Amino acid sequence: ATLKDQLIYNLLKEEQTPQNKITVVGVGAVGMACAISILMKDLADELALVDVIEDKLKGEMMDLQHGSLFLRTPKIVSGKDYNVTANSKLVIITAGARQQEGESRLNLVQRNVNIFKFIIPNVVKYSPNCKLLIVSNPVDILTYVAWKISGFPKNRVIGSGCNLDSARFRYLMGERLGVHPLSCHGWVLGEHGDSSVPVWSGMNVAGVSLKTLHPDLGTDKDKEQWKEVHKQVVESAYEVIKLKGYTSWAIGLSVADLAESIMKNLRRVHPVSTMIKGLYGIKDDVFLSVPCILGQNGISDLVKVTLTSEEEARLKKSADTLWGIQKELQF
Amino acid sequence: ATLKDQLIYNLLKEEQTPQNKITVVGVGAVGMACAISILMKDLADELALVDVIEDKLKGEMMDLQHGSLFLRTPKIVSGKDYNVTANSKLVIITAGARQQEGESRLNLVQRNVNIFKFIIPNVVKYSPNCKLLIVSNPVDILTYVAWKISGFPKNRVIGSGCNLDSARFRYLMGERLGVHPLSCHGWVLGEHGDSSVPVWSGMNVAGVSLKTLHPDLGTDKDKEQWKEVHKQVVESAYEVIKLKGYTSWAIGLSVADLAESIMKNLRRVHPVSTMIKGLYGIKDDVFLSVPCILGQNGISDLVKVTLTSEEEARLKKSADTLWGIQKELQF
Amino acid sequence: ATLKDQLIYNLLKEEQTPQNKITVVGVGAVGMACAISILMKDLADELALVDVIEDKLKGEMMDLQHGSLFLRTPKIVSGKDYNVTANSKLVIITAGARQQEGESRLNLVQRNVNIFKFIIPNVVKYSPNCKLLIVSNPVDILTYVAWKISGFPKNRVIGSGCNLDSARFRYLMGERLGVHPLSCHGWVLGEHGDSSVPVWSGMNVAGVSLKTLHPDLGTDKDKEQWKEVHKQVVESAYEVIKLKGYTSWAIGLSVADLAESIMKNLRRVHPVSTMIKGLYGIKDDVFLSVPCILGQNGISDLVKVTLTSEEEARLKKSADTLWGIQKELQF
Amino acid sequence: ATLKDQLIYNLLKEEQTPQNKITVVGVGAVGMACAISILMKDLADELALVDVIEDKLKGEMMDLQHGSLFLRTPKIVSGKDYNVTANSKLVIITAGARQQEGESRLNLVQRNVNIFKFIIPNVVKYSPNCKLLIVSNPVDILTYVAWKISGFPKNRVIGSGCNLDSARFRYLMGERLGVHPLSCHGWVLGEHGDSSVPVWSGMNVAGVSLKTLHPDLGTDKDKEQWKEVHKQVVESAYEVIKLKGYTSWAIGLSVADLAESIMKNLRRVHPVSTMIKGLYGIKDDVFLSVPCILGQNGISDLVKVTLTSEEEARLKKSADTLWGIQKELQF
Ligand SMILES: NC(=O)C1=CN([C@@H]2O[C@H](COP(=O)(O)OP(=O)(O)OC[C@H]3O[C@@H](n4cnc5c(N)ncnc54)[C@H](O)[C@@H]3O)[C@@H](O)[C@H]2O)C=CC1
Ligand SMILES: NC(=O)C1=CN([C@@H]2O[C@H](COP(=O)(O)OP(=O)(O)OC[C@H]3O[C@@H](n4cnc5c(N)ncnc54)[C@H](O)[C@@H]3O)[C@@H](O)[C@H]2O)C=CC1
Ligand SMILES: NC(=O)C1=CN([C@@H]2O[C@H](COP(=O)(O)OP(=O)(O)OC[C@H]3O[C@@H](n4cnc5c(N)ncnc54)[C@H](O)[C@@H]3O)[C@@H](O)[C@H]2O)C=CC1
Ligand SMILES: NC(=O)C1=CN([C@@H]2O[C@H](COP(=O)(O)OP(=O)(O)OC[C@H]3O[C@@H](n4cnc5c(N)ncnc54)[C@H](O)[C@@H]3O)[C@@H](O)[C@H]2O)C=CC1
Ligand SMILES: NS(=O)(=O)c1ccc(Cc2c(-c3ccc(F)c(C#CC4CCCC4)c3)nn(-c3nc(C(=O)O)cs3)c2CC2CC2)cc1F
Ligand SMILES: NS(=O)(=O)c1ccc(Cc2c(-c3ccc(F)c(C#CC4CCCC4)c3)nn(-c3nc(C(=O)O)cs3)c2CC2CC2)cc1F
Ligand SMILES: NS(=O)(=O)c1ccc(Cc2c(-c3ccc(F)c(C#CC4CCCC4)c3)nn(-c3nc(C(=O)O)cs3)c2CC2CC2)cc1F
Ligand SMILES: NS(=O)(=O)c1ccc(Cc2c(-c3ccc(F)c(C#CC4CCCC4)c3)nn(-c3nc(C(=O)O)cs3)c2CC2CC2)cc1F
């Protein structure tokens, strides 16, 4: 008698099961940028959104649903309860505490660990086979936390790491050379942010090593100060933060690129934070960024970059510092 | 002798000239949502951003630039000076002031008028042949204001209008019927927001009229309450505003859909606000949403929807109301 | 000691389980146009090709693989043995025998049944849960054949049907009106080919029914001859065959559009051939195109289009024809 | 009284001027593969087709046109008269003769030259500022012939060259490494096809030089015989030709990739054929593939790849062979 049954004859009432589902936890500026980027790249058939602030969560969900006409992701759901995240192929963690003015980063990482304490078991309960992509900072430490709490094998726990750092690097290099960043190749590895390691030997266009072409590259004998490109990779992040309060658009796009490789089993190589024990001279359980092959099972393989002595020592120092701080985290 | 010259032989020094350039004025949540959606749909070879808040403007520009690796838009610029907007094909106006504590809406519209009196002359000086897409609210009033200041012919002054309302309507229609909104068809015309007009006679799936199938559609006698579907088109917008403070993603996606038809000369039909004097019985210079054919010259044609007497009398009342405000706006 | 192990460290050694796999059976012009459109829409994570001409099958596969740099489908395989098709979500049948000089449709129809008698068991063997998409002609008859041999439920056997006929309808309509085909709405139903049925009541732009505007529309007394559009729907296909020997691009694109809704669970509405017994006054097991809601389970629902007596009578006449031909098929 | 006029009110009837128009001359398998690939990447607002076979030309045009519902390119035109190509931004030449049974290859090149003597002045006539992308074989010779006939500056005459050979190289490299070809970097330079030169020093994943890890890379004394990978770049093409009669899909995709850089002004680096006189040690007016920066003015820059002694000598010997042949041709 209703219009819907007058218009439409149902011939199979199967409960709908998602097949390419993505969950984003934390709907701040970063989570929503990941969300819109994943939606506009058609990477999911279902998107779930989780936060603890219920009205903002519901409003962001509704705002996306109102753009359904223009998308190809037919189901967008949200809620504070994690039943909405069930059977996600990929869970992306962008949640974190709001830093208060004058607050110590030392205090802040424990507050983010405490958040992860609640989030990770809930994610695991409802998506035991999902891949975890950790974006929240400090991302290398938090990816280790996520790995420990979840009990997942290391291939399924991935930190955003230096993927964004390397994208900034290629942007800046492209600005210097007058070439699209796609054609400027260069790798920033190790810790996300201040302590990242530029691998000068690998910087190239068309397979032409800039370092070989210009041996003073990365030194203080470099008349053009190309080391400043890596200083600017770090400083431009702080400048964005200073100018608009936070960063969001570039990390969103870089996360979607990662999601693309995982969701479509592409086996592209990206610089992401992975559990690096037993490689590159690391003897402890820590996560640092190295080139990783990304696909349907997460990190199936990584690339062993040859590093200088200087670059190796910086990685090992990062590893030591990460391990020592992690041993002081309260789980 | 520089690294750049050792690597690259230059054979051509030709001034770069953008071919598919889009400017967004106002980098609030709405302007930036338009920007990211336009960027991810590859609609522009150059994007320019303008605002009066200089640090926020530079930070948003830089944040987009850092994701250049993942985009196909090779140049992103910004500035408070409109020389960065020169020779835009399309300029999208998302600038406005913010209501103060208990500020009157009539006083707020005049403040937005004062803003357009600065913006529009500056746009026209640098892109005298662009199309203007007005998004700021009240959008039908402000589209007329932009038209009168610009001196543009009506085909190149377009108000976002009911494109978003209609998209919300199809999401809500689709939720009732269990059908993707792309396959749900239905038009909301007239003013954006409170006074919009649902055209029940046009509501259909597979060319099957719901109204002819269910003659109570749109009436108060209807026990299925299909009028609520249009009530939700207005109410769900106020609810998003209440829940997250503003709306952004849906308007950004819908503006990008409009930009796509314009920039690709698609001649798709969209409900947008256009100077409607001489149609639907209206005799004053006002802008209201009707179905418009959109392409490289803006609005080249419009669809003459048959309206009932009730629907037609709502368009007339809206026109009279718009006319009465505009005569008392100072610009 | 090898280069591969020197450069790459393997952490995961897990078998490759395909996730969004598509098979195309028959790599003639139609099968390869479906293949390229599927590849360029990023619809599959693995594409499988099958034919009985082994040289042509390998050359097509290798040609596609040589373009892998520009695609997002990392696995393309081919084989005469159906183990390569295992665990497909969607299996597309574009296979058929080549018409000889002087042979009629009634000489060739059984040759294609012989084809389907070999294909369909091997397909069902290695992908028991796949959705079947029948493109081969006579498409309505062959979908019945596939349905009977497969033993699949009616929701999982889809005939390409009048999807292409309707696409041509909307192109021709848009040509007359100067509107993009996307904004021109119109439905050709029933049999693919000569006996297809245009639903005049469904033709509209912006929800404005052309029939109401123009009562003679679809009649012989039409001074504007709007019946000729459907005549051209049929004649344009013969004209393309006469001119280039066959048709391939438009059917390729329409098949990829169908695949999109199925693989992404969009629940869009398309005119496709489905087992219509018990609906639309049909009383025999025959496949005719009606608007079907397409998703992860195939046809989960269909739209009940209200027909005129003339349109309904022709649907029964088609149903009578198919059933009488089907009684003469050798299984 | 006309239905279109009752339905649609026209506000401007300005003449349509296409803004991002691409022409493809030659609608064989290669030209049509270029068309569909360009169509599915939305690179053009108008696509023009030219051939001498008038029936085949019209049928391909119509076949594409019937898929307009699924495309974002509103105008598809064709004709034997170059009027339809007017104001193309990009003209792609895929025209050529069929070698008669036992026809000497040198007599065949003259015949393709005679084709170009007809095509190129007609192209220049109707699109004097277009970029010319030459695909027909022998492509390096014919690109020179197009440049000499057209009178165009070097930056606007581009041969497809080794862009396809390098895509094949990266595919083969990726299959050996278990990595997506996108992340496999490697450059094939010089002549298209048999005499192409692999640049082993450029081969890398994540900036890790395979030559530095595995010094035997490219030698005859190579344990793993990586020289076969370049040999397979050449033999795989002949194999596709032998197996299916011709190659089409991969060249179509590579050409669409070049078009994307040119039409969007990306300044990506591609190995394409360019007038190499005065560079890489060459003294003759010949075209050879080097890494070129591609944008809205064609080739504005190229990368100066450091070559080993024998790569440089093979490139010098290729220039010598092309010049001697270009001396034997009449145009
Ligand atoms: N790895 C990288 O390259 C980058 C990482 N980030 C990091 O992403 C994180 C988020 O950045 P913003 O969006 O700007 O922060 P934000 O504070 O604006 O948003 C974070 C959201 O997490 C939510 N939250 C807190 N506890 C939660 C809990 N148990 N469960 C669910 N949600 C919870 C919060 O309600 C908040 O909405 C930060 O840690 C940031 O440093 C940002 C840019 C670059
Ligand atoms: N028509 C539609 O369907 C929709 C329209 N809107 C409207 O979009 C407009 C912007 O929305 P929000 O981003 O949320 O507000 P917002 O206030 O956060 O952003 C406004 C930006 O405009 C800038 N501005 C003010 N004066 C300027 C001037 N002379 N020149 C350049 N920039 C100037 C402001 O600095 C601000 O950054 C509002 O008017 C809103 O009502 C919102 C959603 C739907
Ligand atoms: N439903 C629709 O709207 C349309 C359907 N079609 C139909 O698609 C079918 C194919 O069209 P074309 O590619 O032009 O024909 P085609 O003759 O060029 O290719 C058909 C391929 O099927 C192969 N074949 C024969 N028996 C086979 C078997 N057991 N297993 C696997 N492969 C087998 C053949 O070797 C051939 O390569 C035709 O029936 C055509 O009428 C074409 C356009 C419109
Ligand atoms: N550069 C590369 O890497 C590759 C280039 N090719 C080359 O592309 C060319 C075409 O390949 P196919 O389509 O397979 O050959 P085809 O012979 O099937 O098509 C060539 C078309 O050019 C047309 N033609 C001949 N003279 C003409 C004239 N004055 N004006 C206009 N059209 C004319 C012909 O009618 C023909 O349809 C060949 O030369 C082939 O070697 C193919 C793949 C790889
Ligand atoms: N490898 S690690 O130990 O994991 C690690 C340590 C420090 C940081 C800094 C940091 C932080 C950050 C937020 C909040 C924090 F609480 C901490 C911390 C800490 C402790 C960890 C050891 C002692 C204190 C950190 N955020 N953040 C951001 N980056 C962006 C971007 O767009 O790139 C935006 S914000 C940065 C990167 C800075 C360039 C902007 C990151 C990080 F990855
Ligand atoms: N046709 S018109 O006169 O052009 C016109 C009049 C009133 C409104 C309401 C309005 C307004 C709005 C902001 C600020 C204002 F100052 C005025 C006003 C006024 C005067 C002139 C009429 C009465 C005093 C209005 N914003 N806004 C927004 N919509 C969205 C969305 O996401 O859809 C987000 S905000 C809405 C639409 C509501 C559903 C949310 C819109 C409008 F189009
Ligand atoms: N409803 S049905 O019985 O299923 C059915 C019956 C007849 C046809 C005709 C037909 C056929 C066709 C090829 C080969 C055949 F053997 C038969 C048959 C048969 C038997 C079953 C009726 C009596 C012997 C058919 N192909 N074909 C093509 N269409 C296109 C296009 O681009 O649209 C390209 S080819 C057409 C459509 C014509 C416009 C070209 C189609 C069809 F769907
Ligand atoms: N540098 S150049 O002088 O420009 C030049 C010389 C020879 C060739 C070979 C050639 C040819 C070809 C067709 C027809 C021809 F007539 C000639 C010739 C010649 C003369 C030259 C010296 C004396 C007679 C050539 N086609 N072709 C094709 N490639 C593909 C693919 O998919 O890669 C498909 S066909 C190839 C590349 C081979 C892998 C198949 C290419 C070429 F670029």
Coordinates of N, CA and C in Angstrom, one line a residue, chain C residues 133-135 139-140 158-171 186-193 196 233 250-262 268-274 288-292 294, chain D residues 66-67 69-70:
Chain C
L133 N 27.1 -11.5 -15.8 CA 26.6 -10.4 -16.7 C 26.7 -10.9 -18.1
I134 N 25.6 -11.1 -18.8 CA 25.5 -11.7 -20.1 C 25.4 -10.5 -21.1
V135 N 26.4 -10.4 -22.0 CA 26.4 -9.5 -23.1 C 26.1 -10.1 -24.4
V139 N 20.8 -11.6 -26.5 CA 21.2 -11.4 -25.1 C 20.1 -11.9 -24.2
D140 N 18.9 -11.6 -24.5 CA 17.8 -12.0 -23.6 C 17.7 -13.5 -23.6
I158 N 22.4 -11.5 -14.9 CA 22.0 -10.2 -15.4 C 22.3 -10.1 -16.9
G159 N 21.3 -9.7 -17.6 CA 21.5 -9.5 -19.1 C 21.7 -8.0 -19.4
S160 N 22.7 -7.8 -20.2 CA 23.0 -6.4 -20.6 C 21.8 -5.7 -21.2
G161 N 21.0 -6.4 -21.9 CA 19.6 -6.0 -22.2 C 19.6 -4.6 -22.9
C162 N 18.7 -3.8 -22.4 CA 18.4 -2.5 -23.0 C 19.2 -1.4 -22.4
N163 N 20.3 -1.7 -21.6 CA 21.1 -0.7 -21.1 C 21.8 0.2 -22.2
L164 N 22.3 -0.5 -23.2 CA 22.9 0.2 -24.3 C 21.8 0.9 -25.2
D165 N 20.7 0.2 -25.4 CA 19.6 0.8 -26.2 C 19.2 2.1 -25.5
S166 N 19.1 2.1 -24.2 CA 18.7 3.4 -23.4 C 19.8 4.4 -23.5
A167 N 21.0 4.0 -23.5 CA 22.1 5.0 -23.6 C 22.0 5.7 -24.9
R168 N 21.8 4.9 -26.0 CA 21.6 5.5 -27.3 C 20.4 6.5 -27.4
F169 N 19.3 6.1 -26.7 CA 18.1 6.9 -26.6 C 18.5 8.3 -26.0
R170 N 19.2 8.3 -24.9 CA 19.5 9.5 -24.2 C 20.5 10.3 -25.0
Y171 N 21.4 9.7 -25.7 CA 22.3 10.5 -26.6 C 21.5 11.2 -27.7
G186 N 15.2 8.9 -20.0 CA 14.4 8.1 -20.9 C 14.7 6.7 -20.8
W187 N 13.7 5.8 -21.0 CA 13.8 4.4 -20.8 C 13.4 3.6 -21.9
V188 N 14.3 2.7 -22.5 CA 14.0 1.7 -23.5 C 14.0 0.4 -22.8
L189 N 12.9 -0.4 -22.9 CA 12.7 -1.6 -22.1 C 12.3 -2.8 -23.0
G190 N 12.3 -3.9 -22.5 CA 11.9 -5.1 -23.2 C 13.1 -5.8 -23.8
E191 N 13.0 -6.2 -25.1 CA 14.0 -6.9 -25.8 C 15.1 -5.9 -26.3
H192 N 16.4 -6.3 -26.1 CA 17.4 -5.6 -26.9 C 17.2 -5.7 -28.4
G193 N 17.5 -4.7 -29.1 CA 17.4 -4.8 -30.6 C 16.1 -4.3 -31.2
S196 N 12.6 -3.5 -29.0 CA 12.6 -2.7 -27.8 C 11.5 -1.7 -27.7
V233 N 17.3 4.6 -32.5 CA 17.9 3.8 -31.5 C 18.2 2.4 -32.1
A250 N 30.6 1.8 -27.2 CA 29.4 2.1 -26.4 C 29.0 1.0 -25.5
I251 N 29.0 -0.2 -26.0 CA 28.6 -1.4 -25.2 C 29.7 -1.6 -24.1
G252 N 31.0 -1.4 -24.5 CA 32.0 -1.5 -23.5 C 31.8 -0.5 -22.3
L253 N 31.5 0.7 -22.6 CA 31.3 1.8 -21.6 C 30.0 1.5 -20.8
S254 N 29.0 1.0 -21.4 CA 27.8 0.6 -20.7 C 27.9 -0.6 -19.8
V255 N 28.7 -1.5 -20.2 CA 29.0 -2.7 -19.4 C 29.8 -2.3 -18.2
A256 N 30.8 -1.4 -18.4 CA 31.6 -0.9 -17.2 C 30.8 -0.1 -16.3
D257 N 29.8 0.7 -16.8 CA 28.9 1.4 -15.9 C 28.0 0.4 -15.1
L258 N 27.6 -0.7 -15.7 CA 26.9 -1.7 -15.0 C 27.8 -2.4 -13.9
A259 N 29.0 -2.7 -14.3 CA 30.0 -3.3 -13.3 C 30.2 -2.4 -12.1
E260 N 30.2 -1.0 -12.4 CA 30.5 -0.1 -11.3 C 29.4 -0.3 -10.2
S261 N 28.1 -0.2 -10.6 CA 27.1 -0.4 -9.6 C 27.2 -1.7 -8.9
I262 N 27.5 -2.8 -9.6 CA 27.6 -4.1 -8.9 C 28.8 -4.2 -8.0
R268 N 22.3 1.7 -7.9 CA 21.7 2.5 -9.0 C 20.7 1.7 -9.7
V269 N 19.9 2.4 -10.5 CA 18.8 1.8 -11.3 C 19.3 1.9 -12.8
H270 N 19.3 0.7 -13.4 CA 19.7 0.5 -14.8 C 18.7 -0.4 -15.6
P271 N 18.5 -0.1 -16.9 CA 17.6 -1.1 -17.6 C 18.4 -2.3 -18.1
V272 N 18.2 -3.4 -17.4 CA 18.9 -4.7 -17.6 C 17.9 -5.8 -17.7
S273 N 18.3 -6.9 -18.4 CA 17.4 -8.0 -18.6 C 17.4 -8.9 -17.5
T274 N 16.2 -9.2 -17.0 CA 16.0 -10.0 -15.8 C 14.8 -11.0 -15.9
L288 N 13.5 -10.1 -19.8 CA 13.3 -8.8 -20.4 C 13.8 -7.7 -19.6
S289 N 14.2 -6.6 -20.3 CA 14.8 -5.5 -19.5 C 13.7 -4.7 -18.9
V290 N 13.9 -4.4 -17.6 CA 13.1 -3.5 -16.8 C 14.1 -2.7 -15.9
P291 N 13.8 -1.6 -15.3 CA 14.8 -0.9 -14.4 C 15.0 -1.7 -13.2
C292 N 16.3 -2.1 -13.0 CA 16.7 -2.9 -11.9 C 17.7 -2.2 -11.0
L294 N 20.8 -2.3 -8.9 CA 22.0 -3.2 -9.0 C 23.0 -2.9 -7.9
Chain D
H66 N 27.7 7.0 -29.0 CA 26.6 6.3 -28.3 C 26.9 6.0 -26.8
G67 N 28.2 6.2 -26.4 CA 28.7 6.1 -25.1 C 28.8 7.4 -24.4
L69 N 26.7 9.1 -22.7 CA 26.1 9.1 -21.4 C 27.2 8.8 -20.3
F70 N 28.2 8.0 -20.7 CA 29.2 7.5 -19.7 C 30.5 8.3 -19.8

